[PDB]
Amino acid sequence: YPQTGTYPDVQTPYQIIKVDGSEKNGQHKALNPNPYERVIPEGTLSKRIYQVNNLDDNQYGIELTVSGKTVYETEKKSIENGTITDPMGELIDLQLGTDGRFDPADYTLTANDGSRLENGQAVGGPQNDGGLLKNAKVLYDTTEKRIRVTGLYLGTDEKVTLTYNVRLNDEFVSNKFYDTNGRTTLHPKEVEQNTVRDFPIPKIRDV
Ligand code: NI
């Protein structure tokens, strides 16, 4: 087993460990960052395999979270029109519709104010106006194989969660671990175009 991954932004290691439910013939088939949450200057981010959907067929659910920070100068949010960029890893197939597109039915985007996207539309929140997700979108390109979430505005104890499912491609090499994602990042602030923060990356393999 690889013991670590490396955050590209700051070039420090994170530990990775066995995912519960991934044991098969005395070996484990999946690894998660430990811890899977990372404290960044703007708040907290996280990424993990959060469930095993079908171990033999190498299908897993993936979960990302982000939460922000309130600053007084005027209140301001540390995450302000922020963007998540989440490329699928090499040999990782995102689970898509019958139509071959990433549709509302293939992901969830929810927030801790009780808002969520429903068929692409933000609903709920304490004002029933879409709340924390009023301006959020989930985008996918089938060629680049990359999810983006735009429109994040988050202060203290304001948190958003994304889930989706993936499957290891049949062309896997035996015993090789594959990162579930390419470099996965949060750009917290539209006003700071060069500030980027890495999410840690889970890994999977088959025999
Ligand atoms: Ni629904």
Residue numbers in the entry: 145 to 217, 588 to 721
Paper text:
The D2 domain is formed by the association of 2 “halves” encoded by sequences flanking the D3 domain.
The covalent complex His-Jo-His-In was formed only when both WT forms of Jo and In were mixed, while each point mutation totally impaired the complex assembly. The structure of the complex shows that the Jo and In moieties grasp into an 11-β-stranded sandwich. The two partners are locked together by the isopeptide bond formed by the fusion of the side chains of Lys191 and Asn695 in proximity to Asp600.
